[PDB]
Design an enzyme around this catalytic site. Sequence first.
Site, PDB file in Angstrom:
ATOM      1  N   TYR A  40       0.884  -1.143   0.000  1.00  0.00           N
ATOM      2  CA  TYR A  40       0.000   0.000   0.000  1.00  0.00           C
ATOM      3  C   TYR A  40       0.926   1.198   0.000  1.00  0.00           C
ATOM      4  O   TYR A  40       2.064   1.117   0.482  1.00  0.00           O
ATOM      5  CB  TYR A  40      -0.991   0.019   1.187  1.00  0.00           C
ATOM      6  CG  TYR A  40      -0.447  -0.188   2.591  1.00  0.00           C
ATOM      7  CD1 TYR A  40       0.372   0.760   3.205  1.00  0.00           C
ATOM      8  CD2 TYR A  40      -0.826  -1.308   3.333  1.00  0.00           C
ATOM      9  CE1 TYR A  40       0.794   0.596   4.532  1.00  0.00           C
ATOM     10  CE2 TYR A  40      -0.409  -1.483   4.654  1.00  0.00           C
ATOM     11  CZ  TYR A  40       0.397  -0.535   5.247  1.00  0.00           C
ATOM     12  OH  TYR A  40       0.820  -0.743   6.539  1.00  0.00           O
ATOM     13  N   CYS A  41       0.447   2.290  -0.586  1.00  0.00           N
ATOM     14  CA  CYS A  41       1.211   3.523  -0.714  1.00  0.00           C
ATOM     15  C   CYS A  41       2.613   3.278  -1.274  1.00  0.00           C
ATOM     16  O   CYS A  41       3.599   3.706  -0.687  1.00  0.00           O
ATOM     17  CB  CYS A  41       1.330   4.243   0.627  1.00  0.00           C
ATOM     18  SG  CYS A  41       1.999   5.921   0.442  1.00  0.00           S
ATOM     19  N   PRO A  42       2.712   2.594  -2.427  1.00  0.00           N
ATOM     20  CA  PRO A  42       4.017   2.316  -3.042  1.00  0.00           C
ATOM     21  C   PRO A  42       4.727   3.616  -3.387  1.00  0.00           C
ATOM     22  O   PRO A  42       4.087   4.599  -3.761  1.00  0.00           O
ATOM     23  CB  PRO A  42       3.648   1.533  -4.298  1.00  0.00           C
ATOM     24  CG  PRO A  42       2.330   2.149  -4.670  1.00  0.00           C
ATOM     25  CD  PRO A  42       1.621   2.199  -3.330  1.00  0.00           C
TER      26      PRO A  42
END
Length: 266
Positions: free
Chosen positions: A142-144
């Site tokens: 998540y949130c790369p």
Amino acid sequence: EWQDLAQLPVSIFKDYVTDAQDAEKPFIWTEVFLREINRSNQEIILHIWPMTKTVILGMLDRELPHLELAKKEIISRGYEPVVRNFGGLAVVADEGILNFSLVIPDVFLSISDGYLIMVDFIRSIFSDFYQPIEHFEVETSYCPGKFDLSINGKKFAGLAQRRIKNGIAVSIYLSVCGDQKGRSQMISDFYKIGLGDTGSPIAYPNVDPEIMANLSDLLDCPMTVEDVIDRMLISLKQVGFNDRLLMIRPDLVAEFDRFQAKSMAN
């Protein structure tokens, strides 16, 4: 390199979020410190802010077709959704997650340099462990981000950056301990529900719970957020930094309330 900034004193501001009602506190301080580092550009601010169960949503997240239905996925696990109109992709915070910011004055440059300053800091903090720390995007996390931190292919930290004039705020969310697989599954659910059958042109991460992990696991060494904070503060002296307590002057509180009032009227 992190040690290159040792010329400036590091002001410490440990300010935990112990109640979901103060979930916006850290972000308000970020704004305040970004201005202060411009007025007082002779120091570095280390703002430490671990939080209670919270999911921070950004600009793209709030555009989800079925947002409110998605927020329910967050609420059902006992986490509080926090929306930041200009923030990045959903990130998770809780008792086993360490969040902090390095507020730096541009007086020693680039967006990359800023991120690399944080990477060096993290590496320095855990220099006692042999496990090398790498940075490259973990697309299924998540949130790369381009500067996602990992060990043996697993991501344990995500970074962020915001700038204002000659001031830079580099932030990081570190998975120290706890149920990382659960945090990951929660966000996967968020996007699944949020997108529903409507879909979107926005490329949201396709979360893989097995690609992210806690640092205590990757380093095979049980540690708490408080343990990392201590290890981090200790690394400063060794690297050559002088530190001190950041004093919340009445002026700083005053500015905090202006930003708080702004938000409230919104």
